[PDB]
């Protein structure tokens, strides 16, 4: 028998489902989906980190004019300064008074820190939804791990489970994302070879092992001081260092629906988004016939204690007169109230105690023990909250 | 490796009281990538 139901996509909330196979005693199944993971497919565009300014010894051409050649290097800067007369500890470096030139050279590469301190630019597309669950099946807890696509059958204790498809295809990760250690950011990052100086992407490396890097850092070489051998320069400060302080709060703090964000791999956890359909093909052996199950008669219900809250604040005592000894399923016929226990051991001319949860001050509900219903009248009082820490 | 290399004199903008000199303790590069606050300082001497 195939039982089809729909539960909201919320982890840590046990849901009760009534399985009613015609000519067979009702079956109560408790279903709870712990974690819900939304892992998007990533495509690495580039890596960014703090840049490094490689400045070799300046070419001081004594009595001659140096020539700048166009070098294919990131942020390559070359400038030949005329009328230079530099000094060292033991006097002038050049024989000539005039006609001495200094060739200043500079280029930008990845810093030594790039393997340790870096941000990754990813293209996020089509999030794969996965769930961890728990089913109270035949008085025992069974764990079913399946893809929430509606086309992945997982069989546990002869019961076939088909989870999904997810009502929401949402994945907390726009098309373009940026990852730094344990933090994920939704950012429309500049493409490779389009990074601006002093901003995220001033230096771009396709992979962290890449040899040739892109660089656009506002490197401008300045004229050296009179009689001084040095390479003065003006440069836009590190875009990665600037982003580290300007990034703001990560997705773990800003994402709606109380999403928890994790890395390695990047995923949205507990993104309570939408609902989840559940299909359970329960085998014939699990079911017990109405004749084989005890018959409930002369039923009465009393509520000695009730508090309307999120947890099971209500207590109900149900008196009965059972035809034989056996297991009976307990289920609330009113959607306003939910019962904690799914199965109770029935005896004879005895009584049973149940725990229930409701939000109503005046709770009117029907309890189905096996195949017979009993009306419960409850006057539930407000809780202290206040505030609770779960 | 120090049999091939040697300490040197290089330009320093302030050798004391804001005056420039050919320093035997000239500063080359100060690295501050360490998040623990440790500074890796490069000097002209050995």
């Amino acid at each position: 028998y195939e039982h089809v139901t729909v539960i909201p996509n919320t982890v840590g909330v046990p849901y009760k489902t009534l399985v009613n196979r015609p000519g067979y005693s009702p079956m109560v199944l408790e279903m709870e989906l712990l974690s819900v993971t939304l892992e998007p497919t990533l495509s690495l565009d580039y890596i960014t980190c703090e840049y490094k300014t490689v400045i070799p010894s300046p070419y001081v051409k004594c009595c001659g004019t140096a020539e700048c050649k166009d070098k294919n290097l990131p942020d390559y800067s070359c400038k030949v300064f005329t009328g230079v007369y530099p000094f060292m500890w033991g006097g002038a470096y050049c024989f000539c008074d005039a006609e001495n030139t200094q060739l200043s050279e500079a280029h930008v590469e990845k810093s030594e820190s790039c393997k340790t301190e870096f941000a990754s630019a990813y293209r996020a597309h089509t999030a794969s939804a996965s769930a961890k669950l728990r089913v109270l099946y035949q008085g025992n807890n069974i764990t079913v791990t399946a893809y929430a696509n509606g086309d992945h059958a997982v069989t546990v204790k002869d019961a076939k489970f088909i989870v999904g498809p997810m009502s929401s295809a949402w994945t907390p990760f726009d098309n373009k994302i940026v990852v730094y250690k344990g933090d994920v950011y939704n950012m429309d990052y500049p493409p490779f070879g389009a990074g601006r100086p002093g901003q995220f992407g001033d230096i771009q490396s396709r992979t962290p092992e890449s040899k040739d890097v892109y660089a656009n850092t506002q490197l401008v070489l300045q004229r050296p001081a009179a009689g001084t051998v040095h390479v003065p320069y003006s440069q836009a400060p590190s875009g990665f260092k600037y982003w580290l302080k300007e990034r703001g709060a990560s997705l773990q703090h800003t994402a709606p629906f109380g999403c928890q964000i994790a890395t390695n791999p990047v995923r949205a956890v507990n993104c309570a988004v939408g609902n989840m359909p559940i299909s359970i093909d329960i085998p014939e052996a699990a079911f017990t016939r109405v004749v084989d199950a005890p018959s409930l008669t002369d039923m009465s219900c009393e509520v000695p204690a009730c508090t309307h809250s999120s947890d099971f604040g209500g207590v109900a005592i149900i008196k009965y007169a059972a035809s034989k000894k056996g297991k009976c399923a307990v289920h609330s016929m009113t959607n306003a109230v939910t019962i904690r226990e799914a199965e109770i051991e029935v005896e004879g001319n005895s009584q049973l105690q149940i725990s229930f949860s409701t939000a109503l001050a005046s709770a009117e509900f029907r309890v189905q023990v096996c195949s017979t219903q009993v009306h419960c009248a409850a006057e539930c009082h407000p809780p202290k909250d206040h505030i609770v820490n779960y | 490796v120090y049999k091939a290399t040697r300490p040197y004199l290089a330009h320093c903008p302030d050798c004391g009281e804001g005056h420039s000199c050919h320093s035997p303790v000239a500063l080359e590069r100060i690295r501050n990538e360490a998040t623990d606050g440790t500074l890796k300082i490069q000097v002209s001497l050995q």
Side-chain angles (χ1 to χ4, degrees):
Chain A
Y1 176 80
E2 189 192 43
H3 179 75
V4 182
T5 183
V6 176
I7 67 149
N9 187 29
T10 310
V11 164
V13 184
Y15 301 106
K16 297 262 155 53
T17 192
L18 185 69
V19 181
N20 188 66
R21 194 187 177 190
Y24 293 86
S25 193
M27 192 190 282
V28 181
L29 294 169
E30 185 183 71
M31 302 182 301
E32 195 205 313
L33 299 139
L34 311 138
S35 67
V36 178
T37 304
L38 294 157
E39 197 196 302
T41 309
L42 306 174
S43 184
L44 182 74
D45 272 352
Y46 63 88
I47 300 289
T48 200
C49 49
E50 199 179 313
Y51 66 75
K52 188 190 172 177
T53 309
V54 174
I55 316 133
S57 291
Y59 177 62
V60 181
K61 199 180 188 289
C62 299
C63 307
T65 60
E67 286 175 76
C68 275
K69 58 186 264 78
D70 192 79
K71 289 236 261 284
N72 190 55
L73 288 152
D75 263 332
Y76 185 76
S77 305
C78 195
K79 217 163 180 181
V80 172
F81 307 100
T82 57
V84 177
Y85 191 81
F87 284 94
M88 272 171 77
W89 68 274
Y93 175 71
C94 299
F95 161 76
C96 296
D97 300 285
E99 279 164 43
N100 309 297
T101 57
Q102 190 195 104
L103 183 137
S104 279
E105 252 191 303
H107 83 269
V108 174
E109 67 178 55
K110 280 201 293 290
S111 176
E112 305 87 348
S113 62
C114 291
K115 288 174 269 180
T116 303
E117 287 290 326
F118 71 101
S120 309
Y122 291 109
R123 279 197 173 271
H125 43 265
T126 317
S128 189
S130 62
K132 222 169 142 98
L133 197 74
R134 179 190 64 88
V135 188
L136 223 186
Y137 185 80
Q138 298 178 304
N140 295 280
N141 282 313
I142 61 152
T143 303
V144 179
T145 308
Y147 285 102
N149 72 147
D151 195 58
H152 182 49
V154 172
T155 311
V156 177
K157 251 91 176 72
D158 215 30
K160 192 190 254 74
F161 289 84
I162 295 158
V163 167
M166 303 281 275
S167 70
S168 188
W170 184 89
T171 171
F173 302 106
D174 290 326
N175 185 65
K176 280 189 175 181
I177 62 136
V178 165
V179 185
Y180 172 73
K181 292 180 180 182
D183 295 286
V184 182
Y185 295 88
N186 271 340
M187 198 219 290
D188 184 58
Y189 57 84
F192 196 95
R196 288 208 73 89
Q199 295 291 110
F200 184 95
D202 60 342
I203 177 146
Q204 290 164 330
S205 187
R206 287 266 173 59
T207 53
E209 290 86 51
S210 175
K211 288 281 160 73
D212 13 60
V213 298
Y214 165 79
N216 184 24
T217 64
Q218 267 190 285
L219 227 190
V220 178
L221 297 166
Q222 296 172 339
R223 181 177 174 87
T228 303
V229 191
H230 78 309
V231 189
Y233 66 99
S234 57
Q235 198 183 26
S238 180
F240 174 73
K241 279 191 108 74
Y242 185 71
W243 174 74
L244 283 181
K245 72 179 193 85
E246 299 293 321
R247 56 201 225 248
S250 65
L251 284 161
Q252 168 66 58
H253 311 272
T254 64
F257 310 105
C259 294
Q260 303 291 296
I261 308 294
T263 55
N264 198 68
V266 314
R267 57 210 128 93
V269 193
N270 302 345
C271 273
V273 69
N275 50 261
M276 189 193 280
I278 294 164
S279 180
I280 320 149
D281 202 291
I282 310 140
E284 187 123 43
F287 291 101
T288 50
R289 296 186 153 90
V290 290
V291 187
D292 288 292
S295 189
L296 276 283
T297 38
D298 300 290
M299 285 207 292
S300 59
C301 177
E302 60 195 337
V303 177
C306 194
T307 298
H308 61 83
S309 58
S310 299
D311 68 330
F312 302 97
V315 171
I317 298 156
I318 300 148
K319 287 183 180 189
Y320 64 90
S323 61
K324 58 184 173 285
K325 190 187 172 179
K327 277 96 176 74
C328 274
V330 186
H331 201 256
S332 182
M333 294 294 280
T334 312
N335 303 303
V337 345
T338 323
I339 304 156
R340 195 214 287 175
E341 42 275 273
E343 201 177 76
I344 63 104
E345 201 185 82
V346 118
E347 282 278 357
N349 49 297
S350 189
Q351 54 152 258
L352 69 114
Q353 200 191 285
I354 56 141
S355 297
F356 70 95
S357 190
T358 190
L360 276 87
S362 303
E364 242 78 269
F365 63 101
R366 295 168 291 155
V367 178
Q368 189 181 264
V369 184
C370 261
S371 289
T372 321
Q373 282 171 257
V374 63
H375 185 82
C376 295
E379 200 212 12
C380 309
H381 302 110
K384 60 172 181 178
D385 264 311
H386 292 45
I387 310 295
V388 77
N389 53 65
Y390 266 24
Chain B
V1 86
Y2 299 97
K3 90 216 290 176
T5 68
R6 65 166 201 173
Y8 61 96
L9 288 155
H11 171 250
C12 179
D14 186 1
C15 295
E17 249 76 89
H19 295 281
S20 186
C21 89
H22 304 280
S23 182
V25 69
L27 294 173
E28 287 292 337
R29 189 188 171 192
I30 309 152
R31 286 173 64 193
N32 65 157
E33 311 115 14
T35 58
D36 79 324
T38 308
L39 300 164
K40 190 177 181 162
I41 307 148
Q42 195 181 333
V43 83
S44 78
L45 52 83
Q46 293 171 343

